[PDB]
C-alpha cells in the first residue's frame, strides 16, 4: 500500500530510519525524496523545522526541502532522497572535498545567522550521482540515546564557536575512516568535558596529517575564542589543491628573494628551520643534488622555484627524479612533511598583502 | 479574491506577464511565479514540467517547486524572480550594481549545464534569462528558464527556419544576448522587429564595440564567433567560458606571465614568437616605448616579445622599484595590467590567439578549452 496527504506520498513498507518519528522513502510531484512522518506533539517544532528550511535550502550543501503537508494526524516533511549519511558512508567519493562542501554549507549556515548546534555524521547527507557522477554532502537537521560532538560550552544561545567543534571531530572521523578524537562512541562526551582528545591516527612524519592535526587541534579547542570561523578553516592549506601548494611555495620564494636575514621573515621562517629541512635538507634528496646553505628553509624554498621556474630548460635525470605541477611539489612535501605546515604560519606576517590574502583569512 | 489550487495560490490581479498567463503567487510559504497553462497545453506542460524536475540542480538555471492540475487549467510554480534580462536592459532595474559580465557569465554557466544533459534550449532570448531576488548577502544571479520546448523573433539561429537542433543553436542566441548586455539595448542584428530578417541575411554589425577599448576587442572576437553564420565554427558553452572575455584582471596578468615564462627560453627563429610577432607592429603602437608614461620610459620597442618580457620583470621585481615608478604603474594586479591593456588594446587578444599552440601543455590548459 501507499500513503497519500497532498502532493506527498510513501509506501509504510520503505522506512528509511528515526524522537518519537519515521522517515520514509517517498515521491512529491514525481521527485524521490525523503519524507520524515511526525506526530501532533511536535507540530509546533516542526513549523520552526520547517521554517528554517525554507530560509536555507538554497546552497548546494545544504539540504534541499520540497515541500510539508498537514494532515488529520500526522504532519510531513519532504526532503531531498540521498545515497547515504557521512555515518554510513564510513561505518559501512574524496574525504577532503566533502569536509569542504560541508564546511561550506556549514558557513553559509552561519552567514545567515544560523547555527547548527548539533552538527555530526548523522545530520550530513550524501547525495545522489546527478547524471554526471557527481555526489555531495549537505548539512541537515540544523538550528533545533547519546551525544558525542557536541561542544563542551553547551554542558541556552550557543555562537557559532560551536558547529566549529563538531566539525573538528567529523574532520577527524572522515580522515581516521571510523575514529573519534575523543575516543569510542559511548566515550566522547564524557572525554569532550574532561578534555581528553586525542589524534592517534594523524602520524607527526605524513605530510597531509601534520597539516590536518594543525587545523583540527584549532577546530576543536577547549576555548571557544580559539577556533577558527567556518570561512576561516575554509582557507587553510587542508583544502589546498597541489597546484595551489606549489604556488604558494613560489610566491614566498618571491618575496625572500629581497629580504634580509636580518628582517623578521627571515627569522621567523628560520626560527627552528634545522628540524624542517631535517638537519641538512641536502642529504635528503641524487640527480637533484646537482645544485651548483643546506640548513636554510629559504634556500629550500629559492631550490624549488628555480628548477620549476627552469623546468622546460632542465635535463631529463633532473626532471626524472623530480611531473610538472603535482608530482613535483609531492616531491619536496613528501621529503620535507614540515615544510608547508612552518612556511604557512611563519608567513602569516604578510597576511594582510595583497599576494597573499587569497592564501589567508581575515575580512 | 485569492485562488487556491491545492498547494498553490494567487490573487488573479497580480498579473506578472501573458495564451498563458502568469500570476504571482505561493507555495508552501515560498514567494512563487505561477503560470497556468490552458486544457489545449497539458500535453506540453507534462513536457515541460518533465524537462524543470531533470533540470533543476543548478543555480543558473530556474528553481521549479510544485505543479497542480486542475479542471480550468494547469498550475506551474517556480522562483519568484526580480524581473526579466529584458526588463532590466530595457528601463528603474538599471541599477542594483549590477555586472554585466558576471550575468553573461551565469547564463553561460546555466546552458553549458543543460547542454550537458543532452538538452538544447531551442529559444534563448532576454525574456527567458530571469534576474533573481537579492539573497541575504545582496548577490542577484541569472537564471535560464523556458528551456527545450517546440510575438515575434529575433534570437532565433539561422539554420532553425530552414528536424530537432544542435547545441550550437542555443550559442548564436546566446551570442546576440552578449551584445544585448554590452550595448545596453543594442542588437547586432538590428531593431526588435527587423531581428529575425537580417538574420537569414548577413546584416549583422557590433559598431558599438570599438578597436580602441581593450574590453571591446575582447567581447568582438569573442562574440563574431559566436554568432558565426555557419554552425561548425560556434564555440560551445563550456568554451565560451574559457575566453579571455570572463578574465578577472589578476587572470589577464597571470596570463602574460606564464606566456612571457614559456617564451623566456625560446629562440626569435622558432615557430612561437613569429607567430608572437605576426602584426606585432600594431599590436605595439609603432614603439611601445613611446606610448608608456614619462615615469616608466626611463626603466627593442617594436617586438611583443620584449613587451611581455618588460610587464613580467616589471611586476616580478615591483616590490623593489621606484615610489614615483609605482605611482605609474599603479597597484598590483588590478591597475598594473590595466596599465598596459589601455595603451595596447589589442595585446591580450592578440597574445591569447598567438599562444594557442600550447593548449594542451597544462601551465595553459587553464586558458584554453580542449577535450
Ligand atoms: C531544520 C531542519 C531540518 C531537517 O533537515 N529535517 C529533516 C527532514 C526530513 C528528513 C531529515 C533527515 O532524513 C533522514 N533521517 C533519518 C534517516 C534517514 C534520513 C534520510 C533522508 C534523506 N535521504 C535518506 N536516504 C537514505 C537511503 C538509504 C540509506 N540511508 C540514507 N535518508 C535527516 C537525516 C535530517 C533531517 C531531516
Ligand atoms: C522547460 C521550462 C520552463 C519554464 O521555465 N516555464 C516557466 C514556468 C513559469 C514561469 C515562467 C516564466 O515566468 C514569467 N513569465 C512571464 C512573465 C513573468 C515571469 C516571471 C517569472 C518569475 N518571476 C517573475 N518576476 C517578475 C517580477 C516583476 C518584473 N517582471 C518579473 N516573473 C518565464 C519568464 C519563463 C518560463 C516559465
Redesign the interface.
Given at each position: 500500500s501507499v500513503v497519500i496527504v497532498?502532493?506527498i506520498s510513501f509506501c509504510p513498507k520503505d522506512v528509511l530510519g528515526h524522537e518519537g518519528t519515521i522517515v520514509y522513502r517517498g515521491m512529491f510531484?514525481?521527485?524521490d525524496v525523503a519524507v520524515k512522518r511526525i506526530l501532533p506533539e511536535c507540530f509546533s517544532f516542526a513549523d520552526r523545522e520547517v521554517q528554517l528550511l525554507?530560509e536555507s535550502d538554497?546552497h548546494?550543501n545544504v539540504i534541499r526541502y520540497?515541500?510539508?503537508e498537514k494532515d488529520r494526524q500526522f504532519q510531513y516533511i519532504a526532503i531531498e532522497l540521498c545515497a547515504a549519511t557521512l555515518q554510513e558512508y564510513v561505518e559501512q567519493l574524496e574525504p577532503i572535498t566533502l569536509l569542504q562542501q560541508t564546511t561550506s554549507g556549514l558557513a553559509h549556515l552561519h552567514?545567515?545567522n544560523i547555527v547548527h548546534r548539533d552538527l555530526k555524521p548523522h545530520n550530513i547527507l550524501i547525495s545522489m550521482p546527478?547524471?554526471?557522477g557527481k555526489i555531495k554532502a549537505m548539512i541537515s537537521d540544523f538550528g533545533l540515546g547519546t551525544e558525542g560532538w557536541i561542544a563542551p560550552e553547551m554542558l541556552e544561545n550557543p555562537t557559532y564557536t560551536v558547529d566549529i567543534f563538531s566539525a573538528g571531530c567529523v574532520f577527524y572521523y572522515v580522515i581516521s575512516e571510523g575514529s573519534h578524537p575523543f575516543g569510542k562512541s559511548l566515550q566522547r562526551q564524557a572525554n569532550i568535558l574532561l578534555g581528553a582528545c586525542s589524534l592517534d591516527c594523524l602520524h607527526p612524519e605524513k605530510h597531509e596529517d601534520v597539516i590536518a592535526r594543525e587545523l583540527i587541534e584549532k577546530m576543536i579547542a577547549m576555548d571557544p575564542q580559539k577556533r577558527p570561523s567556518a570561512k576561516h578553516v575554509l582557507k587553510h592549506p587542508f583544502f589546498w589543491s597541489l597546484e595551489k601548494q606549489l604556488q604558494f611555495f613560489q610566491d614566498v620564494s618571491?618575496?625572500i628573494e629581497?629580504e634580509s636575514l636580518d628582517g623578521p621573515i627571515v627569522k621567523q621562517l628560520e626560527r627552528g628551520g634545522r628540524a624542517v629541512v631535517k638537519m641538512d635538507w641536502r642529504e635528503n634528496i641524487v640527480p637533484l643534488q646537482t645544485d651548483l646553505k643546506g640548513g636554510s628553509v629559504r634556500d629550500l624554498l629559492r631550490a624549488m622555484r628555480n628548477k620549476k621556474?627552469?623546468y622546460?630548460?632542465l635535463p631529463a635525470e633532473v626532471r626524472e627524479t623530480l611531473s610538472?605541477?603535482d608530482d613535483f611539489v609531492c616531491y619536496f612535501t613528501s621529503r620535507f612533511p614540515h615544510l608547508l605546515a612552518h612556511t604557512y604560519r611563519a608567513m602569516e606576517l604578510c597576511s594582510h598583502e595583497?599576494?597573499f590574502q587569497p592564501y589567508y583569512f581575515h575580512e
Open positions: 497532498g502532493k510531484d514525481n521527485r525554507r538554497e548546494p520540497f515541500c510539508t552567514s545567515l546527478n547524471a554526471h618571491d618575496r629581497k621556474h627552469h622546460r630548460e610538472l605541477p595583497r599576494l
